[PDB]
Amino acid sequence: SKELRQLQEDRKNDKKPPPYKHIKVNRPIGRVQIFTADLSEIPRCNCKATDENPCGIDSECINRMLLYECHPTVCPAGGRCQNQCFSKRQYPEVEIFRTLQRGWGLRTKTDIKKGEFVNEYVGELIDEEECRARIRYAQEHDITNFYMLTLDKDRIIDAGPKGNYARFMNHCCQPNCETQKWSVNGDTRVGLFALSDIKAGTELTFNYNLECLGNGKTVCKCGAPNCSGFLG
Ligand SMILES: C[S@@+](CC[C@H](N)C(=O)[O-])C[C@H]1O[C@@H](n2cnc3c(N)ncnc32)[C@H](O)[C@@H]1O
Ligand SMILES: [Zn+2]
Ligand SMILES: [Zn+2]
Ligand SMILES: [Zn+2]
């Protein structure tokens, strides 16, 4: 109970989170590269411009089904294509709030429908050498908040120093969002998507699936009845 009493006090006193730079797109650091592909490598889906909601959430779209974003100059549905979520950056409105046991969190200001694009997990894109250095620094300074998610081998998104609102989304063993790795313009991106209808005011969470680098020993405080005890 000793730690809880302190947490009650902290929640009262903590007016704002530590500063970070709010950015729109991933920022490669050092020798990290972002890759591109020729347009010939972007798939054309099965949607037609005459369909009710071409390439939409509820459509038959194979690109959406395989986690490929359509390209606007290529998609058979043309300007009616509803599968350009990462590039268009239309996110549901959200706000940061202070939790008791899980630091700062994020809650939605609007209703969100099952399958809707919620956010892109954006940050600095760093290599293993840089990740280890940052994790070691944090550990040496008793920092227990990590914002690192692997994109692929030797390319890690660190939303700590620079990121967007997705950096505030906490882990839950019964979450209402999930990460998905998509191919956008010939390279990988990490999106957050709603698992169910979510009501305005609700905290947005996802299952970290042990991907948050540095949290491998962390005890989960999500409070779900099916809690694994860890961030995954
Ligand atoms: C991506 S940040 C989420 C925002 C963070 N709570 C903050 O104050 O900035 C991930 C960190 O939040 C904490 N965290 C998130 N979910 C948690 C959970 N279910 N149980 C315990 N700590 C959690 C851990 O310290 C983790 O390293
Ligand atoms: Zn389509
Ligand atoms: Zn399309
Ligand atoms: Zn849990």
Spacing of C-alpha 141 from chain mean position? 26
- The annotation status of 103 as a binding-site residue, yes or no, is yes
Question: Is the Cβ atom of 206 under 6 angstroms away from ligand 1?
Answer: no
Ligand 4 centroid to residue 166 C-alpha, Å: 19
Q: How many CB atoms lie within 10 A of CB 187?
A: 16
Residue 212 Cβ contacting ligand 1 at under 6 Å: yes
Q: Give me the residue label for tokens 């169910």.
A: 196
Question: From residue 47, how far is each of 15, 50, 64, 72 by CA, in Å?
Answer: 49, 8, 10, 13
* Ligand 1 atom at minimum distance from 104 CA: 8
User: With a 6 A CB cut-off, is 20 part of the ligand 1 pocket?
Assistant: no
Method: X-ray
- The ligand 1 atom nearest the CA atom of 221: 20
The DSSP letter of residue 95 is: E
Residues recorded for the chain: 232
Of 167, 24, 38, 22, give the one whose Cα is nearest residue 86. 24
- Residue 80 is given by DSSP the state G
What's the resolution in A?
Answer: 1.8
User: For residue 155, what are the domain limits?
Assistant: 1-232
Distances 229 to 166, 173, 209, 225 between C-alpha atoms, Å = 23, 9, 12, 11
Indicate the number of domains in the chain: 1
CA distance 72 to 189: 18
CA of 75 to the centre of ligand 1 (A): 39
Residue nearest to atom 24 of ligand 1 (CA): 145
Ligand 4 centroid–CA 188 distance in Å is 28
Question: Hey, what's the torsion of the CAs at 105, 217, 179, 155, to 10 degrees?
Answer: 110
* Distance between Cα 197 and ligand 2 center (Å): 23
Looking at the DSSP bridge assignments, the partners of residue 157 are 125, 149
Q: Can you give the CATH number for the domain in which 229 is found?
A: 2.170.270.10
Report yes or no: 58 and 83 within 8 Å, Cβ to Cβ.
no
| 170 annotated as belonging to a binding site for a ligand | yes
Task: Identify the DSSP state of 76.
Answer: T
Contact between residue 206 and residue 175 where contact means Cβ atoms under 8 Å apart: yes
Q: Is 104 helix (H, G, I), strand (E, B) or coil?
A: strand
- Inter-residue contact 33 to 188 (CB < 8 Å): no
Helix (H) or strand (E) holding 124: strand 123-126
Contact 146, 213 (CB under 8 A): yes
Three-class secondary structure of residue 199 per DSSP: coil
Q: Is the CB of 207 under 6 A from ligand 1?
A: no
Please tell me if the CB atom of residue 167 comes closer than 6 angstroms to any atom of ligand 1. Answer: yes
Side chain identity at 160, as an amino acid letter?
G
